[PDB]
């Protein structure tokens, strides 16, 4: 039809990247665009223009992530990793995960997507050594995958609750969880008078 079959009820991983690229990120500019009191200007229509026309080299600012990546593609920026991409905060989340079998830890919805973007595009901007960050992103990925496999023993006619599951972790499971719960509902509602 008008929409391809592999998109009919879900997002492609590239559309899940596009959604995450709409978030604010903190950067250190390597250009001063700010004009002194003593020139081209941004004029955007989907995001706050007033943050970019006021850059000063090495004073941090927030911009939308797709502009930070476009500036970082030149030497013209550096991307400040969020506080949760630190070897301290990842190791507290790994401890939380091991300590609470019944729940996922309070990682932000975009954590796998943003880790994968910044490890490829901003590999030099981490304060911690990136091989220990990749190592702990994998340690978190694997623990949450066990907790997901435990959760699927409970597919149901009524609902599930999946509190801190990432958007990328929901998006891989969507065409399985919803397709099976749909047949459990059809088998159940068929039995009713």
């Amino acid at each position: 039809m008008s929409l391809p079959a592999h998109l009919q009820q879900t997002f492609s991983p590239e559309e899940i990247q596009f959604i995450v690229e709409n978030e604010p990120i903190k950067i250190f500019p390597r250009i001063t665009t700010r004009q002194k009191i003593r020139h081209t200007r941004w004029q955007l229509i989907t995001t706050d223009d007033k943050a970019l026309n006021n850059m000063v080299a090495m004073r941090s600012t927030e911009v939308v992530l797709w502009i930070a990546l476009l500036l970082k593609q030149q030497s013209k920026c550096s991307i400040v990793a969020p506080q949760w991409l630190t070897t301290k905060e990842l190791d507290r989340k790994i401890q939380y995960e091991k300590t609470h079998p019944d729940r996922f830890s309070e990682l932000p919805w975009n954590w796998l997507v943003l880790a994968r973007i910044l490890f490829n595009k901003a590999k030099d901007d981490f304060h911690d050594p990136i091989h220990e960050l990749r190592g702990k992103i994998q340690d978190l990925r694997e623990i949450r995958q066990i907790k997901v496999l435990k959760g699927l023993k409970y597919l149901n006619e009524s609902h599930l609750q999946l509190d801190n599951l990432s958007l990328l972790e929901i998006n891989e499971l969507r065409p399985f969880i919803t397709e099976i719960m749909d047949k459990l509902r059809e088998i159940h509602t068929a039995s009713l008078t």
Binding site: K123, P129, I130, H131
Partner: protein, 564 residues
């Protein structure tokens, strides 16, 4: 002179001003394929224009006939050209059929400007004076040659250009005499084109380890044939590796650490990717010292491994699987033993890159892989063109193998290089066993009439592998006089011989002023004199093609030529 080393930033800023817009592609790079240095130069220069967001097109070109064809059809919006690796030695203004009056704009004032710039990145000499002085459209880059070497030619060029009877006879034949001595010099390469572009990146402030590796690769490709030039540039590359390498030492290996060390890089064939035995057996230099084509030379090789104390069964193991004790002791084994055979010159320091856990490659081993991709990576006008299309198609295999994301294509290359060097060797022995090198007083002749997988040698580079193998072999023998060598090979389908003129060279350790390839004149001057059918269209103008029956008449007049 045209753009000296001090002023490459002005030529680059002129490209940005003229050819940067978000509207259109405006920049064209013509690159000679079949040249690794032009490849590594153009890779750096594309990573630069990527970072500046300059919309550009790269066109690989085989030879002068395709340069005219592609130039003839450039869209008139294209206002900067880079000619990377060719065109310095031809009159480009005459050859491309430029008249600057059809290109001039905004002529006002002691002033001109033009709708196109043609920047020539070339390391060959002798420079054509009508490019270096005699044009405002062509814009050569220089290593320093013009100011250091051409001052008498500059003066002679202008006094002759101004002078459009005793006082005239006394002077016009002095200045034409200076130009007539300036031409009637043989061809030579005097710099790497990649070290020129790295010195431009050093002026802009763009240097990093990726551009430095491409600088090391481009410059290493010279070492086989222009050793005298590699040794000038090598000290300058050592300084840049130190400058860019980070603080840490006794560092833990991690998947992310690139390390670009300076360390022992023995003058052996594909050591880290082959056995320790094949490393010696297929090395040009080793073959030349041991006379390794004939079976007494092979005895000298086994007798050396036995004396070094390495079993043949170990020497033949693939270098990864060869044992941990031999691979660290090897520096001591060679420093003890090689001197007995005169192989002492095999000890060399070179550049070795290792990325993460994927195991080291030296700059020497990497150019052997990249050349093997150019050589074999995949009605006579169709029979040439569908072959020259193949050599343009191979350029993009070598290009993609410069990317770290594409190690499987480098690993294709490292296998192909070992298939080629084996075929070169199995042909080079046939030449030396069957005595096919004839001594013709002025030069040495070799002509491959028939043989196994002879259909390789129709690529100009593969003919030059066999050339460089036969040259090393002769250049180490202490009785032979150094003479120019002519190497010819038949294509049975086109019915031509590919003929290459080769300079000899001094033995690899002796330490003189250079010697120059004057076949580039001798072939033109004999061609102009004869009614024979030839092609003189290759960028390395020491290489020509000739129809089968015309070859013996051509060589018959080459021996008479006073130009060699």
């Amino acid at each position: 002179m045209y753009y000296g080393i001090s002023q490459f930033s002005e030529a680059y800023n002129k490209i940005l001003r003229n050819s940067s817009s978000h509207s259109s592609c405006q920049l064209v790079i013509f690159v000679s394929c079949l040249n690794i240095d032009a490849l590594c130069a153009t890779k750096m220069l594309s990573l630069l224009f990527k970072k500046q967001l300059v919309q550009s097109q790269i066109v690989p070109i085989f030879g002068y006939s395709e340069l005219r064809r592609h130039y003839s059809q450039l869209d008139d919006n294209i206002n900067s050209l880079l000619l990377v690796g060719f065109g310095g030695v031809i009159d480009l203004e005459a050859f491309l059929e430029i008249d600057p009056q059809e290109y001039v704009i905004d002529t006002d004032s002691g002033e001109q400007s033009f709708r196109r710039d043609i920047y020539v990145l070339d390391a060959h000499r002798p420079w054509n004076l009508d490019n270096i002085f005699g044009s405002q459209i062509i814009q050569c880059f220089d290593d320093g040659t013009v100011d250091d070497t051409l001052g008498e030619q500059k003066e002679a060029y202008y006094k002759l250009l101004e002078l459009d009877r005793k006082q005239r006879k006394k002077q016009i034949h002095e200045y034409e005499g200076v130009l007539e001595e300036y031409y009637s010099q043989g061809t030579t390469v005097v710099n790497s084109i990649s070290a020129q572009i790295y010195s431009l990146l050093s002026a802009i402030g763009e240097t990093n380890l990726s551009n430095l590796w491409l600088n090391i690769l481009g410059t290493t490709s010279l070492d086989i044939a222009y050793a005298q030039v590699y040794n000038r540039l090598y000290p300058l590359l050592q300084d840049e590796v130190k400058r860019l390498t980070p603080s840490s030492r006794n560092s833990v290996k991690t998947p992310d650490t690139l390390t670009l060390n300076i360390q022992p890089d023995y003058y052996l064939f594909l050591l880290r990717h082959s056995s320790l035995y094949d490393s010696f057996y297929y090395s040009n230099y080793v073959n030349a010292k041991l006379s390794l084509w004939n079976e007494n030379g092979k005895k000298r090789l086994h007798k050396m491994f036995a004396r070094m104390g390495i079993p043949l069964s170990t020497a033949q193991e693939t270098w990864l699987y060869m044992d941990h004790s031999i691979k660290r002791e090897l520096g001591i084994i060679f420093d003890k033993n090689l001197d007995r055979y005169g192989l002492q010159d095999i000890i060399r320091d070179g550049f070795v890159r290792t990325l993460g856990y994927r195991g080291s490659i030296s700059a020497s081993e990497f150019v052997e892989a990249l050349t093997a991709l150019l050589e074999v990576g995949n009605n006579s006008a169709q029979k040439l063109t569908n072959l020259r299309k193949r050599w343009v198609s191979n350029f993009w295999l070598s290009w993609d193998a410069l990317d770290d994301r594409k190690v499987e294509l480098l690993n294709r290359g490292i296998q192909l290089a070992q298939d080629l060097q084996r075929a070169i060797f199995n042909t080079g022995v046939a030449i030396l066993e069957k005595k096919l090198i004839k001594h013709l007083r002025i030069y040495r002749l070799c002509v491959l009439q028939d043989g196994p997988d002879l259909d390789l040698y129709r690529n100009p580079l593969t003919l030059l592998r066999l050339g460089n193998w036969l040259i090393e072999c002769c250049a180490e023998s202490e009785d032979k006089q150094l003479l120019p060598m002519v190497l010819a090979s038949i294509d049975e389908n086109t019915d031509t011989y590919l003929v290459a003129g080769l300079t000899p060279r001094y033995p690899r350790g002796l330490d003189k002023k250079p010697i120059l390839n004057n076949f580039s004149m001798a072939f033109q001057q004999i061609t102009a004199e004869t009614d024979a059918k030839v092609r003189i269209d290759n960028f390395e103008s020491s290489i020509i093609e000739i129809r089968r029956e015309d070859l013996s008449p051509f060589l018959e007049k080459l021996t008479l030529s006073g130009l060699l």
